[PDB]
């Protein structure tokens, strides 16, 4: 199905300019399917690109291959994990001889850990683990072709992610203990997303739960498929309009800090009410060192009222509740924050993200099929200072 294409210096400059102008750090995936007679990686094309990027002073991070578990199906070429590790060693030597000698290298961008993908990841980390800065793997919950609305709302579907994460760490801890683990490419549903689902408010349950579980379980970076593009799972549509998952991602960015804590619900069922707890993002100008950010998903069909434990039970709390703009409910492409539709001010201006101050000591209201952030002001948590 997939044919070779070429790309130009112009295309590399379009990509870098976009990243540089947007304050993003570019990671560029190199072609792993360029192979010598005896099925070693042929590095000559990568050398041409490395030399061009060095010549323009482009600070770029590297990957080599995408889903190498799939090469036999996609390209009728099998590369084992041992060989792929050797290929990474050869790329690492090229980076060390380039103008950016400390450039980062990530891999191997394997699919989620089935028997044969786990085997490839294990043989890859044995062989090439020393030269990668982080281990990358990919995750999707469902086939976008067959995914249902019910699937997007089902805690039994959300929970499958936990076993994938546990299996990747089991491989990494048996081969390269302590190596950082990244989700290199992830979203709701593969094959470009679930039509009329992956681009809606309903998509946000999987996205926010995945962020929560990833942070809680030790994943250091989660890369969302895709910021912009042909797939339904895009954060920004073809008209450059932000979808609900964009707004959810912007709020997460503004409110949720680097230090991960834990929240849990005291009842025996820990299924439809999902709660996560970090220190507040120190860069949010509204908040101060020691503040907490709670985020919660309610997959019940009724409102739940959350009570904060001592010593947080009487603190001022800032609510950031997301609900769809009607009439399409969870299948809406528009979202409201505390009842205000989120929309660009103009092409250059994001809107302000207006909190709703709750009366101190009130229970936190979480409507049916909704998600919210709650900042606990003056929490004075020592772990967060």
């Amino acid at each position: 199905k997939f044919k070779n294409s070429t790309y130009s210096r112009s295309s590399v400059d379009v990509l870098y300019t976009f990243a540089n102008c947007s304050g993003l750090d570019l990671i560029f995936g190199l072609n792993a399917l360029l192979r010598t007679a005896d099925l070693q990686w042929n590095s000559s094309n990568a050398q041409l690109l490395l030399d061009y990027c060095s010549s323009k002073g482009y600070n770029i991070s590297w990957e080599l291959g995408n889903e190498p578990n799939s090469f036999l199906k996609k390209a009728d070429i099998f590369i084992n994990g041992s060989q792929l590790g050797e290929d990474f060693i050869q790329l690492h030597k090229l980076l060390r001889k380039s103008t950016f000698k400390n450039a980062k290298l990530y891999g191997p961008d394997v699919g989620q850990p089935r028997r044969k993908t786990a085997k490839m990841l294990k043989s890859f980390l044995k062989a090439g683990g020393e030269v990668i800065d982080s281990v990358t793997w990919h995750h999707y919950y469902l086939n976008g072709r067959t995914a249902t609305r019910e699937d997007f709302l089902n805690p039994d579907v959300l929970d499958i992610f936990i076993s994938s994460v546990q299996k990747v760490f089991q491989v990494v801890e048996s081969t390269r203990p302590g190596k950082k683990v990244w989700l290199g490419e992830t979203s709701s549903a593969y094959g470009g997303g679930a039509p009329l689902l992956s681009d809606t408010f309903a998509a946000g349950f999987m996205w926010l739960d995945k962020l929560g579980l990833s942070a809680r379980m030790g994943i250091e970076v989660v890369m969302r498929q895709v910021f912009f593009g042909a797939g339904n799972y895009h954060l920004v549509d073809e008209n450059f309009d932000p979808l609900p998952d964009y707004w959810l991602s912007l709020l997460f960015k503004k409110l949720v800090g680097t230090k991960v804590l834990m929240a849990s619900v005291q009842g025996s069922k820990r299924r439809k009410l999902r709660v996560y707890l970090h220190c507040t993002n120190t860069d949010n100008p509204r908040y101060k060192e020691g503040d907490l950010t709670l985020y919660a998903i309610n997959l019940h069909n009724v409102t739940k009222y959350l009570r904060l434990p001592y010593p947080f039970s009487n603190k001022q709390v800032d609510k950031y509740l997301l609900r769809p703009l009607g009439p399409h409910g969870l299948l809406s492409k528009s979202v409201q924050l505390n009842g205000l539709t989120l929309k660009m001010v103009d092409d250059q201006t994001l809107p302000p993200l207006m909190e709703k101050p709750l009366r101190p000591g009130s229970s936190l209201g979480l409507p049916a099929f909704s998600y919210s952030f709650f900042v606990i002001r003056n929490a004075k948590v020592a772990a967060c200072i």
Partner: protein, 74 residues
């Protein structure tokens, strides 16, 4: 009854995520779009991308392994 008590563990950080914890991709297949320069040059799109800084932007996808650098091409 629809009231739920939360329990919080706050003693110490259980993990530290990157400041770029929430990162994004661009599919390598987008570079095969004739309008690639228009799309990524969009001032509207760059404003939206700046809102998620700091973050990684990973350029990759199935097409990663079907793309060849041609330094002659225009």
């Amino acid at each position: 009854q629809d009231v739920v008590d939360l329990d919080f563990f706050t003693q110490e950080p259980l993990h530290l995520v990157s400041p770029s914890f929430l990162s994004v991709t661009i599919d390598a297949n987008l570079a095969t779009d004739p309008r690639f320069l228009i799309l990524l040059g969009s001032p509207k799109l760059r404003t939206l991308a700046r809102g998620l800084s700091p973050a990684y932007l990973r350029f990759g996808g199935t097409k990663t392994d079907f793309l060849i650098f041609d330094p002659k091409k225009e």
